[PDB]
Structures are given as structure tokens and as C-alpha cells.
């Protein structure tokens, strides 16, 4: 199966672009990153920073994760992110999303050797 690190890159990294430039970005990316094959994933965030910059977050401020686990890390700097939120009329298989671009601190859960992001927890 996909490694946890590779799954995080597929589901949450978009280093190719600095921001989402179209209101259809989430419709396109949720589909193209295989997040709508099994069901419409209701919410997902993509990070528009280099992989190195996101991996570096695992060496930044330790915080709790929303589920109460304690291996989360908050970025020192804000990062470009796109939040994808499923619309009210969305119905599988035509999963439809609202795209919101913002510049916020991110919180990721980190694991492994090398110690890298494995879950996207939150932004603030």
C-alpha cells in the first residue's frame, strides 16, 4: 500500500503552483489526486509550498492534534493553502467543492524516520 508519507504528499501537497487560481481548482484537484474515487471526501487542504518547507514544519512548534494526540507541529510562518469544502448540492460521482485560498499557519502530524508529515491536521 502507499506509505503514509506518500499519501500525505498525494492528498495535501501542491508545490507546482503558488495558490489556487480558479474557482474550479478543488473540483479538478480533488478528482485528480484520487480523493473522490471511493466517495466525495468532504474537506481537504492543499499546501502550495515546497516539499522541503512543509517537511521542515516537523521541526517547528509541537502542538496537540485535534484528536488529542501530541505529535503535531505548527508552522512558524504562514503558508499558502487551499481549502476544499464539498458543496451542499455535491453528489457522488460528480463531487463538487468550494475553493478557498488563504495564507495561514498549518498544523501537521509527523511520523517516521525521516520525520515527515503524515496527516494534515488544521490551519490557524
Amino acid at each position, epitope marked *: 500500500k502507499e506509505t503514509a508519507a506518500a499519501k500525505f504528499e498525494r492528498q495535501h501537497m501542491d508545490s507546482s503552483t503558488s495558490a489556487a487560481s480558479s474557482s474550479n481548482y478543488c473540483n479538478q484537484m480533488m478528482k485528480s489526486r484520487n480523493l473522490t474515487k471511493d466517495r466525495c471526501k468532504p474537506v481537504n487542504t492543499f499546501v502550495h509550498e515546497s516539499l522541503a518547507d512543509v517537511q521542515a514544519v*516537523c*521541526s517547528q*512548534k*509541537n*502542538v*496537540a492534534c485535534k484528536n488529542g*494526540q*501530541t*505529535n503535531c507541529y505548527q508552522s512558524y510562518s504562514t503558508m499558502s493553502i487551499t481549502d476544499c469544502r464539498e458543496t451542499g448540492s455535491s453528489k457522488y460521482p460528480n463531487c463538487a467543492y468550494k475553493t478557498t485560498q488563504a495564507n495561514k499557519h498549518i498544523i501537521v502530524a*509527523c*511520523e*517516521g524516520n525521516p*520525520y515527515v508529515p503524515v496527516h494534515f491536521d488544521a490551519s490557524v
Partner: nanobody
Amino acid sequence: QVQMVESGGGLVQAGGSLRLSCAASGYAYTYIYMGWFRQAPGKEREGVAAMDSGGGGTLYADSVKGRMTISRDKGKNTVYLQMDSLKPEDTATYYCAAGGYELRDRTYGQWGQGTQVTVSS
């Protein structure tokens, strides 16, 4: 960049008490969890004890519970392991770890190099 230091091991005798000490420096925040893991020759690394920054959330491996005590300085990235009566089965390399959750090895991102404890019996 973070300096993880842990110490206190060496050649020791069955029945003795032993204290291992660990500290992180070069980190500008607080590690919520710190703990101790160990690996005996030819065996899997195993969790020994962990504790959170408030001095709670304490957990021990079943085979060491009641025989060793973890502690931490409040407000600090330090952790300690007080071993009450060394057994032969306690021979291992002991590692301190920081920044994870409970005794989940993969969740910890900072590790000391390990201090060898060899128990004679």
C-alpha cells in the same frame, strides 16, 4: 540542530538503583511528550515509559511498571528514568525521545544516541 543528551548508563550490578537523565537544548518550545525506549541485543526497540509536560499522561510498559519511575522538570525539556532494582532483563541500550505521543515509537522525532546499561548477575 536540537541537542538531545542522555546519560547515566554503564556496567552495573543486579539489585542496584540507577538513574538515567535526558535533556533537549536548541529547541525554542516545549515537547509535550518525552519518554524512554530501549533495545536489548537482537531484540525490537520497545517503549519503557513516557510522560507529558504537565507531569501526567504517564505510561509504562507492563514489564517495567512498578519497577521504574519516569519524571520531568515542569516547564522543561528534561526527562528522567529512576530504576529501583536492576534486573538482568534490563540490560539494553536506553534511548530518550521527544515530541511524540505516549509510547508510539514512530511518533517521536527527536532521539538521543542511546546509553548502554549492562546488568551483571
